[PDB]
Coordinates of N, CA and C (backbone and C1' of nucleotides) in Angstrom, one line a residue:
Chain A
X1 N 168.4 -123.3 77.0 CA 167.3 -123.0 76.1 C 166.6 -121.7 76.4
X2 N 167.2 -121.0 76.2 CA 167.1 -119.1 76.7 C 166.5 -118.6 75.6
X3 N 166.6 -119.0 74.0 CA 166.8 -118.5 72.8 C 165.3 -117.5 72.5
X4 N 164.9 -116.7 71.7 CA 164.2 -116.0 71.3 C 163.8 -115.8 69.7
X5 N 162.7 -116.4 69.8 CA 162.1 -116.6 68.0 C 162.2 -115.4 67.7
X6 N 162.7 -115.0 66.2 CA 162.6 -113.5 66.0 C 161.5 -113.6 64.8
X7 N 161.1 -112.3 64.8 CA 159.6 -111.6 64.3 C 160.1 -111.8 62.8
X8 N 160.8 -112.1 62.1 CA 161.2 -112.4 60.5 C 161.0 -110.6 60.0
X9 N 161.4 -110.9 58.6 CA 160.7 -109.0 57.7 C 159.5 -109.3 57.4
X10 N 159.1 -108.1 56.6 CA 158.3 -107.7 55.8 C 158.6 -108.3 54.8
X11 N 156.9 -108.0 53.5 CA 157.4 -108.7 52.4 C 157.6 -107.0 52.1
X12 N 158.4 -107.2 50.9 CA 159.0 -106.2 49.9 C 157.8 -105.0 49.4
X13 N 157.5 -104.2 49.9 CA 156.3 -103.6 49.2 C 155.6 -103.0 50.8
X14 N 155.5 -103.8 51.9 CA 154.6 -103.7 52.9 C 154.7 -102.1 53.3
X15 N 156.1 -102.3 54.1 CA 156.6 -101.2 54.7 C 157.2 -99.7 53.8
X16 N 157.1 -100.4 52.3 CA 157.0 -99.6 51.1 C 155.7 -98.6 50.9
X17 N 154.7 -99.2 51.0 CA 153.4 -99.0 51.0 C 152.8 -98.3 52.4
X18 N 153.7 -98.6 53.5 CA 153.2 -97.8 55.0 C 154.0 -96.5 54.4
X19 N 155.2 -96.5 54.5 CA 156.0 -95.2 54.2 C 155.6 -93.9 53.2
X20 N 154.8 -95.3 52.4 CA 154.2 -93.9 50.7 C 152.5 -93.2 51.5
X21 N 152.3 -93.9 52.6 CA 150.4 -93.2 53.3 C 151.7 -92.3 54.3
X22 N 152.4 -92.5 54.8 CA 153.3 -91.8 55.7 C 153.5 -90.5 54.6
X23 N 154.3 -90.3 53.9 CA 155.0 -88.9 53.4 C 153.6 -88.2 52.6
X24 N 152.6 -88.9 51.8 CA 151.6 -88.6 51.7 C 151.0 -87.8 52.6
X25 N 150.7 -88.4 53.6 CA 149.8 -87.3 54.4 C 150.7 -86.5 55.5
X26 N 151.9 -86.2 55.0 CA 153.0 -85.3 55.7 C 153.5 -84.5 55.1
X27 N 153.3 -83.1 55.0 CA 154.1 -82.0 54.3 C 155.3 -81.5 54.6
X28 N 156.2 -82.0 55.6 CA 157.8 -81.0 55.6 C 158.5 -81.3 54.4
X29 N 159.2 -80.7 54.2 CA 160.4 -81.2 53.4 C 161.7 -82.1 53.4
X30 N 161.2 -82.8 52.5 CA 162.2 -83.8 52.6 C 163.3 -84.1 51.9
X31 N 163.9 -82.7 51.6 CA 165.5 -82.5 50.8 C 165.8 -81.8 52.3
X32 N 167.1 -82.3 53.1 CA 168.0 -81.5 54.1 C 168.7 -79.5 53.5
X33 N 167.7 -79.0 54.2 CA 168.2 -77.7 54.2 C 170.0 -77.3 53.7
X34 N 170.5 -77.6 54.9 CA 172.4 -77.6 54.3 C 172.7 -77.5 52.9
X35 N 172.9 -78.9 53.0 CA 173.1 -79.3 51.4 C 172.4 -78.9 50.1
Chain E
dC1 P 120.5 -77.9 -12.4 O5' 122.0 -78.4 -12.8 C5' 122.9 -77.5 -13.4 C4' 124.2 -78.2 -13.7 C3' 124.2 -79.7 -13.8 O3' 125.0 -80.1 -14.9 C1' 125.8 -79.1 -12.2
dC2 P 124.7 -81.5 -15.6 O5' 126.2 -82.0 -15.9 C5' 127.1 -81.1 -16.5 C4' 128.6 -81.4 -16.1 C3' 129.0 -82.8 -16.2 O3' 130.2 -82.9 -16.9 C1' 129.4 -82.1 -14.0
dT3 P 130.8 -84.2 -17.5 O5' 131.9 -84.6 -16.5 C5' 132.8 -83.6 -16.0 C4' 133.7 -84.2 -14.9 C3' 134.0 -85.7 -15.0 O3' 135.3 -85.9 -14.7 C1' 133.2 -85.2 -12.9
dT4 P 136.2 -86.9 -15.6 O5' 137.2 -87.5 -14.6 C5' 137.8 -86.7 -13.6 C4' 137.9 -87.4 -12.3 C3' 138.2 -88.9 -12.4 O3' 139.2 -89.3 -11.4 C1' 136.3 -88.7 -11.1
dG5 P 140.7 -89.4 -11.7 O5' 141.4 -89.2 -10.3 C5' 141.1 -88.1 -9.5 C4' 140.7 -88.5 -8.0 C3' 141.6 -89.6 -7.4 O3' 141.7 -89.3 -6.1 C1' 139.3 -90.2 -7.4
dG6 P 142.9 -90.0 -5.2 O5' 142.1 -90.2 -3.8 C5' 140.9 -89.4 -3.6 C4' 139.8 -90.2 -2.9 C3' 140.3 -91.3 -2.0 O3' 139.5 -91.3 -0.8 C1' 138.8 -92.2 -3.5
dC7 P 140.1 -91.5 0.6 O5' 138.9 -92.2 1.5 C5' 137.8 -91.4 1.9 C4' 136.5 -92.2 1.9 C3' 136.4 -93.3 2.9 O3' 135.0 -93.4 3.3 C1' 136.2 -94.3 0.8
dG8 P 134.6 -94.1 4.7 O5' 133.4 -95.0 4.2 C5' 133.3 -95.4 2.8 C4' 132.8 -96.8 2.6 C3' 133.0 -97.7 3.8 O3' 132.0 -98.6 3.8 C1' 134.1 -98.5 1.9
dG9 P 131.5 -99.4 5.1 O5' 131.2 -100.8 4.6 C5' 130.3 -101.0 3.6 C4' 130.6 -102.2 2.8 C3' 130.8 -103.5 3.6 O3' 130.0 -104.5 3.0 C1' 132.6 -103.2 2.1
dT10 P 129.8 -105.9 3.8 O5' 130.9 -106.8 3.0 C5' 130.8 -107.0 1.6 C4' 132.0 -107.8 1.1 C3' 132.3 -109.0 1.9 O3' 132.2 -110.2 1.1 C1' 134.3 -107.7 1.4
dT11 P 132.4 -111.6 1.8 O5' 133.9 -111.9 1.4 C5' 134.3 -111.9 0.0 C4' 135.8 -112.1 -0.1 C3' 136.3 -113.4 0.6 O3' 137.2 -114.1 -0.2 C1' 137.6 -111.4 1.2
dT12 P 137.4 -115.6 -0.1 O5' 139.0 -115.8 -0.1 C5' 139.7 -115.1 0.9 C4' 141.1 -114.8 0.3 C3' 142.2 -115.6 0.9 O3' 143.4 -115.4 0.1 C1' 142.3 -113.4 1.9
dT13 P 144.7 -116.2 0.5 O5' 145.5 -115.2 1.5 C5' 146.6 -114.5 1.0 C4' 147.3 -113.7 2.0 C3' 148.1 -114.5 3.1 O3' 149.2 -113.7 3.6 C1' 146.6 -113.2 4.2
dT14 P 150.6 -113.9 3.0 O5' 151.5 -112.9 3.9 C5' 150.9 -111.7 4.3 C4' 151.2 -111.3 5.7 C3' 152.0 -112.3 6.5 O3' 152.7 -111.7 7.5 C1' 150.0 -112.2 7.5
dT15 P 154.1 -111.1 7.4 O5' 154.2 -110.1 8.6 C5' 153.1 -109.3 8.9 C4' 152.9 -109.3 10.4 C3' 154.0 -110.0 11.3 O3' 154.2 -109.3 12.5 C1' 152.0 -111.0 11.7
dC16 P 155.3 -108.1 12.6 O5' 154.9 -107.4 14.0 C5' 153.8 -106.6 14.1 C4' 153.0 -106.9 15.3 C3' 153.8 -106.8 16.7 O3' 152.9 -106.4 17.7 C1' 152.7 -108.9 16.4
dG17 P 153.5 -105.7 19.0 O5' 152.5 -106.1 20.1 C5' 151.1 -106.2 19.9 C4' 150.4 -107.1 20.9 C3' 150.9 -106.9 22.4 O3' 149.8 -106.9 23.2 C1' 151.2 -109.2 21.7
dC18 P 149.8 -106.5 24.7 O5' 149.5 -107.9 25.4 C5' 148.4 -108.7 24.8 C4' 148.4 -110.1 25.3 C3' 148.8 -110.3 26.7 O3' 147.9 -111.2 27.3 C1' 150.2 -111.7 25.4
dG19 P 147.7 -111.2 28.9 O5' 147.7 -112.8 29.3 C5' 147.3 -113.7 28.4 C4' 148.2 -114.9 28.4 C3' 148.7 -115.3 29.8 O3' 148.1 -116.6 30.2 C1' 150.4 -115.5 28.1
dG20 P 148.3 -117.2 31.6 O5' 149.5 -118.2 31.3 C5' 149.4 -119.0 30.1 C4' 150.7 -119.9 30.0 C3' 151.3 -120.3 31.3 O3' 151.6 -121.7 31.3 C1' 152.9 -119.2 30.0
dG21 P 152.0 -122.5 32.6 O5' 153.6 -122.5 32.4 C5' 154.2 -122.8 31.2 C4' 155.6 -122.6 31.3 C3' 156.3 -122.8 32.6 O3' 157.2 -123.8 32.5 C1' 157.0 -120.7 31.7
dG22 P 158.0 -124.4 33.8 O5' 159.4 -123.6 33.8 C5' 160.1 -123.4 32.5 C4' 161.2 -122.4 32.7 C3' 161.9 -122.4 34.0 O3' 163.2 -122.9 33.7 C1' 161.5 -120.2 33.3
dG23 P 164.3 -123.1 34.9 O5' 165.1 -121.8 34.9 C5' 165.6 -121.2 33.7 C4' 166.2 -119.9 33.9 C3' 167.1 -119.8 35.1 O3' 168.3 -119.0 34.8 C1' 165.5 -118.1 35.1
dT24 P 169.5 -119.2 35.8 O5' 170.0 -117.7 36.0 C5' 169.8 -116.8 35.0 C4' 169.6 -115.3 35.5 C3' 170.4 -115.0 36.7 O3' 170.9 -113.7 36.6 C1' 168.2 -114.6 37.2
dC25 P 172.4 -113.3 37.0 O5' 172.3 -111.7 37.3 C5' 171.2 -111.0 36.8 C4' 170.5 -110.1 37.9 C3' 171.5 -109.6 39.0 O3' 171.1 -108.3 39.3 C1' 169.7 -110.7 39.9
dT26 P 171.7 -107.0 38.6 O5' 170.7 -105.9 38.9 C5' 169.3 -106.3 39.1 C4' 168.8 -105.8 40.4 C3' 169.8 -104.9 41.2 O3' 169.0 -103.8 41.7 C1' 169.0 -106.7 42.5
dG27 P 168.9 -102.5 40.9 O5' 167.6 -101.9 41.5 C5' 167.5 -101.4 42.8 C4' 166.3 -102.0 43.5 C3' 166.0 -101.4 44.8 O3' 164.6 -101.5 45.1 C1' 166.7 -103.6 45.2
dC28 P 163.9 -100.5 46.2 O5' 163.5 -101.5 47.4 C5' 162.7 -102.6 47.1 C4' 162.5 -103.5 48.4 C3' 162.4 -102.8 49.7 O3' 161.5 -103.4 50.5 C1' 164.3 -104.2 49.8
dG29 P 160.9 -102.7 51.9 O5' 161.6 -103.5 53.0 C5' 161.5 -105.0 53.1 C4' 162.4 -105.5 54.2 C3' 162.4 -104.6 55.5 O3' 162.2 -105.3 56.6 C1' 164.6 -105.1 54.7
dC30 P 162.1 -104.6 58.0 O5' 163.4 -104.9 58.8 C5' 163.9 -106.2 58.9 C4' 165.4 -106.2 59.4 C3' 165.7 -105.3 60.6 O3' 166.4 -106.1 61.5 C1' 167.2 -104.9 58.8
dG31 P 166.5 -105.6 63.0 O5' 168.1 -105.5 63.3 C5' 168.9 -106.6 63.1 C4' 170.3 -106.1 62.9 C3' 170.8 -105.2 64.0 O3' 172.0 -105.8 64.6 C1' 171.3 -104.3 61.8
dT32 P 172.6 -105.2 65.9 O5' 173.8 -104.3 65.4 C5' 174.8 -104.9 64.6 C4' 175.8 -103.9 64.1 C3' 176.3 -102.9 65.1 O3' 177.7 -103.0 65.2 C1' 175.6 -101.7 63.2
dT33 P 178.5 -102.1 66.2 O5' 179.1 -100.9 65.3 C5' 179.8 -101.1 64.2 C4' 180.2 -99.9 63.4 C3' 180.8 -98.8 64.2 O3' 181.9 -98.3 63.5 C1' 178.9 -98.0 63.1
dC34 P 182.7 -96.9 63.9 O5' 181.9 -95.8 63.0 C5' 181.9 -96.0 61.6 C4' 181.5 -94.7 60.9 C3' 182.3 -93.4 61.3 O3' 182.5 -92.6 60.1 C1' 179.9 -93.2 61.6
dG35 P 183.1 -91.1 60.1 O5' 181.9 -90.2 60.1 C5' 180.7 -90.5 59.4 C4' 180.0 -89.3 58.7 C3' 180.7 -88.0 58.7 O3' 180.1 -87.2 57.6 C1' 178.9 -88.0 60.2
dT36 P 180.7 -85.8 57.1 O5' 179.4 -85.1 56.6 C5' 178.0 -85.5 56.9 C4' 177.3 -84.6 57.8 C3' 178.0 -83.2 57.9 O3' 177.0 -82.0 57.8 C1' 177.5 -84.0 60.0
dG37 P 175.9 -81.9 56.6 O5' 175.1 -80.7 57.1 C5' 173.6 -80.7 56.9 C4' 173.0 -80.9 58.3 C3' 172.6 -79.7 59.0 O3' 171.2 -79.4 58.8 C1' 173.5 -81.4 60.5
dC38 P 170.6 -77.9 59.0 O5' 170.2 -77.8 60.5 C5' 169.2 -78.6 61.1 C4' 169.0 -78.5 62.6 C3' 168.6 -77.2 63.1 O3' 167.7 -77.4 64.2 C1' 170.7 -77.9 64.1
dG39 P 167.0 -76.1 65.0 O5' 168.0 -75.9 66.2 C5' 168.0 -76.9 67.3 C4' 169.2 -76.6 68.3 C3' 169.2 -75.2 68.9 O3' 169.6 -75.3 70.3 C1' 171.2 -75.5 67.9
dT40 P 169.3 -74.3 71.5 O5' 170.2 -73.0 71.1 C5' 171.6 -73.1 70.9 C4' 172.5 -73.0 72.2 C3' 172.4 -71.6 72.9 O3' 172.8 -71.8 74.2 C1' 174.3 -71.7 71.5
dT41 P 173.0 -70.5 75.2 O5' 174.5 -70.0 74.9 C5' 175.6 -70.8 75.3 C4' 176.9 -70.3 74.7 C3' 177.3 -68.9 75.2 O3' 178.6 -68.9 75.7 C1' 177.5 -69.1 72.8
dT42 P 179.4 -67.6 76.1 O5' 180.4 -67.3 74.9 C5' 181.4 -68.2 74.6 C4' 182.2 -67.9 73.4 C3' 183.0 -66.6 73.4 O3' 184.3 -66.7 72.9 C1' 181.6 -66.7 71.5
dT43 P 185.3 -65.5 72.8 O5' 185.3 -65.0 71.3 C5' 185.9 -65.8 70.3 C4' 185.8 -65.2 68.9 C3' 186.5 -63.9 68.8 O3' 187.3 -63.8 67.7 C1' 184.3 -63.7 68.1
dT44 P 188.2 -62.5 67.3 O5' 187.5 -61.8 66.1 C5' 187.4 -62.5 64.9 C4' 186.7 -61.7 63.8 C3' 187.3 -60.3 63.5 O3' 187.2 -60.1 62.1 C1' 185.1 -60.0 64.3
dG45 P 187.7 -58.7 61.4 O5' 186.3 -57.9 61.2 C5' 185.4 -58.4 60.2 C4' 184.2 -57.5 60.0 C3' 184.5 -56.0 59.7 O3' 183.7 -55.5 58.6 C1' 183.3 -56.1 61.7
dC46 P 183.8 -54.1 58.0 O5' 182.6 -53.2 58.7 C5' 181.3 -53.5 58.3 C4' 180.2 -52.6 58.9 C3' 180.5 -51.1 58.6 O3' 179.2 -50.4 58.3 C1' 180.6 -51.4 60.9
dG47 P 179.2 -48.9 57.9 O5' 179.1 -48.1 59.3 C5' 177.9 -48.2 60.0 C4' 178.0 -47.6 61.4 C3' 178.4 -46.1 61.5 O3' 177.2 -45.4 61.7 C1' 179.5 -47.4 63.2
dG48 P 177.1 -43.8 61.8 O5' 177.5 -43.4 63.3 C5' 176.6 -43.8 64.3 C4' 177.1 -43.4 65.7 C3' 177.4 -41.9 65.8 O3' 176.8 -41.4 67.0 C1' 179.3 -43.2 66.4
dT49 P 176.9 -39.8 67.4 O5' 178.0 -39.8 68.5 C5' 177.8 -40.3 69.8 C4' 179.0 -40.2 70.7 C3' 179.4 -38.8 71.1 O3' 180.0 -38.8 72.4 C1' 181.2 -39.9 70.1
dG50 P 179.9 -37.6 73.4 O5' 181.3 -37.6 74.1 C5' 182.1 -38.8 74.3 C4' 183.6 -38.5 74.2 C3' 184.1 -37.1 74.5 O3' 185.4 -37.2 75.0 C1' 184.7 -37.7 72.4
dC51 P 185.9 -36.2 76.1 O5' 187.5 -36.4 75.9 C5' 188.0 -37.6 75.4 C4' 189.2 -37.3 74.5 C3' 190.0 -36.0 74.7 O3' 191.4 -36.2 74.3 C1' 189.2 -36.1 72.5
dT52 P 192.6 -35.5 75.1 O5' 193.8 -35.5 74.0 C5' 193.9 -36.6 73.0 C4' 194.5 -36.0 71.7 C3' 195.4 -34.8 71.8 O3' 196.3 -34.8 70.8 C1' 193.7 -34.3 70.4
dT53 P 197.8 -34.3 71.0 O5' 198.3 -34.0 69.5 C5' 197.8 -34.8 68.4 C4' 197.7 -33.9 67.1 C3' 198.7 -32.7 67.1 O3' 199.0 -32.4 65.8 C1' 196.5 -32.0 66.8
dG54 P 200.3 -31.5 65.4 O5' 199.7 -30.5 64.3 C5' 199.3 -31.1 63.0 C4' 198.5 -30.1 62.2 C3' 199.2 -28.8 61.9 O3' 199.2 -28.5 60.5 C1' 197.1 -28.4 62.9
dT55 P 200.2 -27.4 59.9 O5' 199.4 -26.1 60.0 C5' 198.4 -25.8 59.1 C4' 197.6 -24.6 59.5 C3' 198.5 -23.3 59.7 O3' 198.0 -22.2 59.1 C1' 197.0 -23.6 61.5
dG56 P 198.4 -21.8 57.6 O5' 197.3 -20.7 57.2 C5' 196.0 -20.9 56.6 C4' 195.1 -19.7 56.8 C3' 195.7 -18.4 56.3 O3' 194.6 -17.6 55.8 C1' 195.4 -18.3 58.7
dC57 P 194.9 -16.2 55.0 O5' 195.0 -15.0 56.0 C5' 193.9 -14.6 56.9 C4' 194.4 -13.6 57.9 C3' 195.2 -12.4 57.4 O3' 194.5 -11.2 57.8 C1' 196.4 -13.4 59.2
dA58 P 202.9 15.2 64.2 O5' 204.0 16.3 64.0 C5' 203.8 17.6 64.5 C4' 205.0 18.4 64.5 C3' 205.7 18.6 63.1 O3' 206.2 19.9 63.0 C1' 207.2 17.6 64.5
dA59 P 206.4 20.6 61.5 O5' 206.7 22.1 61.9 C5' 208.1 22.6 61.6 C4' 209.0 22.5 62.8 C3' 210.4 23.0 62.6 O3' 210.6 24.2 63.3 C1' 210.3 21.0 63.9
dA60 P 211.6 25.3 62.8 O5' 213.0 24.8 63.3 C5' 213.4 25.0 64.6 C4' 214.8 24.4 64.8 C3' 215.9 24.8 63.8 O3' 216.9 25.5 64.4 C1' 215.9 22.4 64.2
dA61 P 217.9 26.4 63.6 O5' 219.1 25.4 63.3 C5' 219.9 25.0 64.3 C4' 220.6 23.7 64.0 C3' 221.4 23.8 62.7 O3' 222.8 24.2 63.0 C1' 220.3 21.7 62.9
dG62 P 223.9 24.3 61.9 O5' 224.6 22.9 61.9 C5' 225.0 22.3 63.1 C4' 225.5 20.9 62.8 C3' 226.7 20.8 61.8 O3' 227.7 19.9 62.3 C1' 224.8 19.5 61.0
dA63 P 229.0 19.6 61.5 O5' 228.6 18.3 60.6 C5' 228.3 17.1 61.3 C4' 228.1 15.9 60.4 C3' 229.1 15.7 59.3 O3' 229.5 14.3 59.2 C1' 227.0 16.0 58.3
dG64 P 230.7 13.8 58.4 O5' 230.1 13.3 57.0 C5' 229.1 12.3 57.0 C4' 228.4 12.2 55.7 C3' 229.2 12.0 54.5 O3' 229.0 10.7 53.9 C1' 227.5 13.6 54.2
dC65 P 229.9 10.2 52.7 O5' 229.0 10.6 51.4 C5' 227.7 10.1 51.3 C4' 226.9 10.8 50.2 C3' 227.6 10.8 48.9 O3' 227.2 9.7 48.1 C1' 226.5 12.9 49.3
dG66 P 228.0 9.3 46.8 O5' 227.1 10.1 45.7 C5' 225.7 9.9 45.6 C4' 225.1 10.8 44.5 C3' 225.7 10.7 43.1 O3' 224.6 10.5 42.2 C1' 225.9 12.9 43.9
dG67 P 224.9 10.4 40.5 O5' 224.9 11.9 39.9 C5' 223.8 12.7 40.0 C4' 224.2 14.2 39.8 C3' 224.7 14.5 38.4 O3' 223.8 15.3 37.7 C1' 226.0 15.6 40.1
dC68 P 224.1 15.9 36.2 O5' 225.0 17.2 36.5 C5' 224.7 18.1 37.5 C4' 225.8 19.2 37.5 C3' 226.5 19.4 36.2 O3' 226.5 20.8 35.9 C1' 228.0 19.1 37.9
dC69 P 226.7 21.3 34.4 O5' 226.6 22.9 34.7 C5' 227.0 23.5 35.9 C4' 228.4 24.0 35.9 C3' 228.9 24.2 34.5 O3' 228.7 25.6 34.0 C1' 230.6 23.3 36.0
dT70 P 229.5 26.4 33.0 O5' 230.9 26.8 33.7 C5' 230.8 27.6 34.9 C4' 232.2 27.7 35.5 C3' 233.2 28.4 34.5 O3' 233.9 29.4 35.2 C1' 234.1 26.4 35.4
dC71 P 234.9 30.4 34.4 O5' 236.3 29.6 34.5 C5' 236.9 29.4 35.7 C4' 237.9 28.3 35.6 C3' 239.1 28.6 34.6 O3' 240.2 29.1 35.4 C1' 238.4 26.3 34.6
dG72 P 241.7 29.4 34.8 O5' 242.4 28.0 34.7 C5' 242.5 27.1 35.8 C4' 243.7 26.2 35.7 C3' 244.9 26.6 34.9 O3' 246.1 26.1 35.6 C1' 243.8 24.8 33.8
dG73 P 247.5 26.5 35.0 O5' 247.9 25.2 34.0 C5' 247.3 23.9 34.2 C4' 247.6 23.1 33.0 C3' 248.6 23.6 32.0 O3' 249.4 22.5 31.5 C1' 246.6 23.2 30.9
dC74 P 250.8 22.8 30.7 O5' 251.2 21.4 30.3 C5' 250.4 20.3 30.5 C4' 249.7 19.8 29.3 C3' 250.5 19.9 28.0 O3' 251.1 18.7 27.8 C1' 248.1 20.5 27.8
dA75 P 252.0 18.3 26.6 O5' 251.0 17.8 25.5 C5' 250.1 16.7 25.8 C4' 249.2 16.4 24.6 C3' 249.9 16.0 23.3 O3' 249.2 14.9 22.7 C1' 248.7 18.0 23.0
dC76 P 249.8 14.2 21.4 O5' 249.1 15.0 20.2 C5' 247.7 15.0 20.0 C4' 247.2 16.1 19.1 C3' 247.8 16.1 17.7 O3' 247.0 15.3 16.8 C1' 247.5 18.3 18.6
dC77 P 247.4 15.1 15.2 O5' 246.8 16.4 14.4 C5' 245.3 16.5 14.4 C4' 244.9 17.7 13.6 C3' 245.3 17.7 12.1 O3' 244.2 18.2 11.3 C1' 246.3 19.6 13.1
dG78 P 244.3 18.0 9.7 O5' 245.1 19.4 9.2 C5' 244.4 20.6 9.3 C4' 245.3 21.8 8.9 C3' 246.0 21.6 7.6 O3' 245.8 22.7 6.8 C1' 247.5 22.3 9.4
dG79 P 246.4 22.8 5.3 O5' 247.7 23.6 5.4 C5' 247.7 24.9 5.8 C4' 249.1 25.5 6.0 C3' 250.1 25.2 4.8 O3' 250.5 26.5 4.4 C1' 251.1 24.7 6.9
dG80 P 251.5 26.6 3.1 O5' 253.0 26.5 3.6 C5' 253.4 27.6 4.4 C4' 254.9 27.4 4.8 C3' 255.8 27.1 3.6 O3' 256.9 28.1 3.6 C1' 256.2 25.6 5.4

DNA sequence: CCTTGGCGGTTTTTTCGCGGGGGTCTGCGCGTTCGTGCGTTTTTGCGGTGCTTGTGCAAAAGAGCGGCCTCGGCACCGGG
């Protein structure tokens, strides 16, 4: 009995909604130079 | 200042949007494996100096010669 509960996802939107205050308040560019 | 067609209020009618309900599927979330970008050091190209290769601008005398001229000598025209 070693096993480990795992932490489940997000609902659909959550980590949507951290990501959109993330690029929001970050200016680089987010098209790769190279290509 | 004249004129009349049209806005406007009122009354019937008619019809489209939203909500509810239901169902479906498709991006979202996460895990795993793979790629190909940024970052360094190495390689090839443009340039300059030094060294190497080409080349223009005084009579005197004899011997020999070409042109030339007089001349020799001959054949020839004209006539019978």
């Amino acid at each position: 009995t070693g096993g480990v509960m795992k932490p489940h996802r997000y609902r659909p939107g959550t980590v949507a909604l951290r990501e959109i205050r993330r690029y929001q308040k970050s200016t680089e560019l987010l098209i790769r130079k190279l290509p």
